[PDB]
Structure formats: C-alpha cells, structure tokens
C-alpha cells in the first residue's frame with residue numbers, strides 16, 4: 001500500500017491519469033483551476049509506485065506525489 | 081526490369097547552412113540548448129538515422145553514404161600505414177635480415 | 179479590480195520550494211477568478227522536467 | 243643546505259646520476275655509425291642532457307640524499323636563500339594566466355546575457371567578440387580589483403537556494 | 407561561405423583549433439627552451 | 448444509465464496458441480484478472496505477455512495475472528484500435544470485481560460524481576517536519 005497524496009498545485013491537465021499504468025488516478029471536479037478538475041487516488045491499493053504520474057505533471061515541484069510505503073503482492077508487481 | 085537502377089536527382093542541396101544549426105536532424109534538438117543534456121543528446125542521436133525520420137528511403141540513403149564515409153576513413157587509415165610504412169620505417173632493412 | 183501584475187511585466191518568484199526561487203521571469207497572464215494560483219510566469223531557465231512555466235499565487239510573487 | 247639538503251652543484255649523487263644517464267646514452271650510441279642520424283639524434287640527446295644538468299646546477303637547485311632537484315615552496319625560505327624561481331615566481335606566473343582565462347571567460351558570459359537567446363552563442367562562439375575580450379583582458383587584475391571595490395563582482399542574495 | 411564560418415565558430419571546432427594553438431605554442435617553446443624545470447634568467 | 452456489467456465466461460478467447468508468459472499458480476490461490484472487449488473486425492494485436500494474438504468479431508475474453516498486464520492491453524486497444532474494453536478481478540472463490548471504468552467514464556475525463564480521495568488542500572511545499580510526525584505508532588511520512 002503506497003501513499004499517493006496530491007496537492008492544490010494541480011491544474012487538472014490529467015496527464016498523470018493517462019500516464020498511470022495501473023488506474024490509480026482519476027479526475028474529480030474542483031474549482032481551483034481553469035479546467036475545473038483535480039486528480040484523485042481512490043486505488044492506491046493497486047499502486048506499484050512506479051512514479052509515471054510524477055514524471056508527467058507539468059507543475060513545478062510536482063503536484064502528484066508518491067510515497068513508497070509497505071509492499072503487498074500487488075505493490076511488488078507480481079504475477080506469482 | 082524489376083531489378084534496375086533507380087535514383088533521385090539532387091535530393092539535398094550541398095550547403096553549409098545546416099552546419100550552422102547543430103541538432104538540425106531532430107525536432108527535439110533543433111531549438112537550441114537550455115541544458116547541457118542537449119550537447120550529449122546531439123552526439124548520441126547523431127547517427128540514430130531511424131529516429132531522425134520515418135521514411136525508410138531517407139534512412140537508406142543516409143546509411144548508404146555513411147558507409148562511404150567509413151570506407152573513406154579506412155582508405156585514409158590504410159594509406160597512413162603504407163605511408164608510415166614508406167617514409168618512417170625499416171622495411172628496406174627488415175627484408176635482408178628478418 | 180484587476181488583481182495581480184500587468185500582462186508582461188518582469189517579476190520575482192518567492193516560493194521556496196519552486197525551482198525558480200529568487201529568480202526572475204515574465205508574467206504572461208493573471209487569471210481573474212477564484213483560482214488559488216492565478217499568476218502564470220514563463221522563464222528562460224527551464225526546470226528539470228523541461229517545463230518553462232508554472233502557476234503561482236498572488237503572495238509568492240513580487241515585482242521587479 | 244636549507245632543510246637537510248645540499249646544492250646540486252655540490253652534491254655527488256647528482257653528478258653520479260648524470261654520469262649514470264650519459265653512460266646509458268653512450269652504450270646506446272655505440273651501435274651506430276658516427277654519420278648516422280640514429281647517432282646524430284643520440285648525441286643531440288646528450289647535449290640536451292648535459293646542458294640540463296649544467297642549468298640545474300646553475301640555478302642553485304637543492305639536491306638531497308638521492309641527488310635530485312628538490313623544491314622549496316615557502317616564501318621566506320625561498321626569498322631569503324634565493325629560490326623564488328622554483329615555486330614563488332611560477333605561483334604568480336601561473337595565477338596571472340589562470341585568472342586571465344577566468345576573466346576572459348567571465349566577460350564573454352557577462353556580455354552575452356543581454357541578447358535574444360544567449361544559449362546559441364555558447365555553441366557558436368562570437369569570434370569577433372571573444373577575441374576582442376581576449377586581447378583586452380590583459381590587465382585583468384587591474385580591472386578585477388576595481389570591480390571588487392564596487393560590489394558588482396559579487397551578485398547578492400538573488401542567488402538560488404533550497405530551504406534556508 | 408558565411409554559414410561555413412559559423413561551423414568554424416562552433417564549440418568543438420574552436421576547441422580543436424585553440425587546443426592546437428595552445429599545445430602547438432607550448433610545443434614550440436619546449437623545443438626552443440629545452441626542459442624548463444625552474445625559472446632561469 | 449450505466450451500472451456495473453457482469454460477466455459470462457462463454458465469450459470466446461482470441462486465437463492464441465498459448466505462451467509461457469501467461470498465468471501462474473497465483474491465479475489458483477490469490478487472484479487473476481480477466482479482460483473483455485467488443486471487436487468490430489478480425490485483426491492482430493500484441494499480447495502483453497509476449498507474442499501476438501488475433502481478435503475475432505464480437506466479444507473477446509482474455510485473462511492475466513496482474514493489473515498492469517490488463518491495462519497495458521487496453522492501452523493498445525483504445526489508442527490503436529479505438530475499442531472500449533473493461534477488465535475485472537476474479538478470486539478463486541468465484542467472486543468477481545469490476546475495476547477499470549469504475550464509474551463508466553474512463554478516468555481521464557470528469558464524471559462529476561466520483562469522490563476526490565487522497566488529496567491535500569495545501570501545497571507540497573507546506574508539509575510539516577518529520578520531528579512533528581515522529582512516534583506516530585508506525586513510521587509515517589510527514590505528508591501522512
């Protein structure tokens with residue numbers, strides 16, 4: 001179970017969701033941007049922490065942020 | 081004749097205009113540096129001819145004339161060893177007592 | 179009124195976690211709404227992601 | 243004789259090693275005719291060698307237990323005993339050229355930032371500009387210490403930090 | 407040939423001209439001044 | 448209008464001669480994830496477990512052992528071929544769970560009715576220091 005917490009510096013360009021290879025991220029309405037959207041991580045149980053989200057955030061000092069927590073059989077990326 | 085000579089007359093102008101602009105081969109490099117990773121990606125992506133363009137004909141023409149460049153450098157390299165074999169050697173003396 | 183600086187003025191960034199802290203760039207636009215970070219600043223100094231622009235708040239941003 | 247040492251014109255292991263080298267050159271010289279260029283080269287090596295020992299003893303270089311020229315890198319022991327040419331003269335002969343290259347490279351970077359895109363003129367060096375700063379930077383300590391007095395050498399705390 | 411002189415004014419070409427200048431200067435000095443270990447007069 | 452489609456395993460598999468990169472014994476104990484899509488025409492896609500399988504017209508049923516192995520299949524089924532797949536999660540007690548269009552709309556586009564979990568109404572540069580979150584039971588990041 002990794003810890004993914006995003007912040008208000010989000011602009012809602014949803015490049016983190018398109019980059020997430022595990023559907024950890026989704027786009028929720030939020031009035032603090034022109035695109036009226038801010039990400040959310042309802043599926044951090046499935047996250048591996050490969051940080052493809054925060055390779056893709058445009059904002060300086062990345063808005064999405066992944067904290068490598070305790071690794072279950074889904075966080076280690078195991079077919080076995 | 082399915083097997084036939086087929087060329088294209090003058091595809092590229094012989095011009096020094098693109099030597100003024102380093103990184104001209106790639107979209108990601110032609111806008112100049114802002115970072116020292118530019119000049120390393122310049123030399124890394126330089127002969128990655130498959131990554132410059134998508135046209136297989138343009139790739140093939142680039143690797144065909146680059147091979148003349150490698151052969152042309154080998155002919156300099158061979159001609160060095162015959163020249164350094166000629167003017168700075170003991171090959172005259174070596175044959176009598178080898 | 180029109181909060182924020184003008185359309186193309188020079189500016190100094192005071193966000194201590196930003197890559198352009200204590201560094202000078204150009205405002206390109208200030209969004210006139212209830213957005214938390216309206217002020218859009220473009221730089222010549224690109225960051226480690228190659229992104230030359232960012233949104234900043236009204237208070238992390240000082241003229242000249 | 244400063245720190246257990248001796249002049250190389252006075253020590254004997256120095257002269258023994260000079261005679262050691264000239265022995266090795268001459269037993270190498272013996273394999274060739276006296277007109278041959280492999281012998282003309284070796285006799286020219288000796289006259290560069292024998293003048294080298296003559297010039298090291300001429301300057302008063304200090305030998306020791308091994309008969310080699312030892313250097314004294316302290317002013318006050320080189321100024322007092324006549325050895326500033328070992329270290330104390332080239333420590334300013336260097337630092338002229340060193341800060342020269344620093345100042346020319348400084349002035350080229352300062353005078354390129356007020357442009358359209360200065361990153362292009364670090365690839366393509368403006369040769370009429372760069373050589374112009376190269377010649378006129380020859381009085382760089384005379385220009386730096388005047389810039390040192392203003393406060394224009396040191397940029398202030400506009401410099402970039404992380405979390406002070 | 408203005409574009410050709412831009413190429414001669416790039417970074418590696420000036421580097422390989424100036425390093426042949428600076429080595430070639432120090433090579434000629436170390437020919438006409440054999441083995442300068444210490445600053446003589 | 449949309450809610451929670453179920454599954455029948457009757458739907459045909461893609462024609463694939465089987466690879467050694469497929470399932471493992473984890474499918475028989477923990478979980479294995481099945482994926483469905485509706486193909487318009489018969490064409491040739493790449494298996495994420497190596498090789499190439501051909502899809503057939505109508506429904507297509509395929510099974511994997513990871514979540515990335517299914518979403519790296521839909522990524523080349525949505526971007527290349529403009530299909531609309533969805534993959535599930537099957538447990539060895541027969542239980543099944545619906546995963547990827549979890550509210551119907553794909554997660555890049557707003558649904559206006561999904562709940563914004565795991566967010567901080569503050570800036571990442573405004574975290575507390577680790578001296579404040581020390582002795583929090585377990586070891587704990589200051590972003591909590």
Ligand code: CLA
Nearest residue numbers: 335336339377380431432433435436439440441442443444
């Ligand atoms: C940092 C370490 C270090 C230091 C201190 C030295 C120091 C020295 N080395 Mg050594 N060396 C080093 C590293 C070092 N080396 C390394 C790493 C190597 C292996 C590559 C060598 C290999 C090596 C060899 C093979 C030899 C030396 C030699 C020498 C001596 C230099 C003689 C010389 O060239 O005078 C240079 C004299 C000058 C006057 C140069 C000044 C430059 C100009 C003239 C001044 C500017 C004037 C003018 C304004 C400019 C004109 C431009 C115009 C446009 C106006 C000196 C004792 C030589 C020697 O004699 O040994 C003792 C020698 O044969 N070294």
Ligand code: CLA
Nearest residue numbers: 120121122123124125126127128129130131143146147150
């Ligand atoms: C027929 C010979 C041949 C040919 C045509 C190619 C062609 C290519 N290779 Mg390839 N390669 C070859 C042999 C060959 N390779 C061999 C023998 C190996 C095993 C070592 C590799 C390993 C290899 C890798 C791992 C990669 C390539 C890549 C590439 C592509 C771009 C190369 C480029 O732009 O670099 C331009 C040239 C350079 C940057 C020069 C490199 C500097 C070398 C390493 C220093 C050594 C020089 C010298 C020996 C040392 C002394 C010099 C002295 C000054 C100290 C290009 C399609 C790259 C690619 O396709 O990227 C997707 C890539 O990543 N090749």
Ligand SMILES: CC1=C(/C=C/C(C)=C/C=C/C(C)=C\C=C\C=C(C)\C=C\C=C(C)\C=C\C2=C(C)CCCC2(C)C)C(C)(C)CCC1
Nearest residue numbers: 315316317329330333340341342343344345348382386395
């Ligand atoms: C005598 C001697 C000695 C000693 C010395 C000493 C003791 C010194 C000290 C020193 C010191 C104590 C120093 C300090 C310093 C500080 C600083 C601070 C500096 C600075 C510098 C600068 C700042 C510069 C800059 C620049 C310029 C201006 C020009 C060039 C370029 C550049 C940019 C780099 C010895 C024996 C060893 C050796 C011999 C000689």
Ligand code: SF4
Nearest residue numbers: 010013014015016057
């Ligand atoms: S982080 Fe970058 S990508 Fe993720 S949401 Fe905020 S803006 Fe869109």
Ligand code: SF4
Nearest residue numbers: 020047050051052053
């Ligand atoms: S962490 Fe790895 S998985 Fe979770 S979102 Fe960022 S990238 Fe996708």
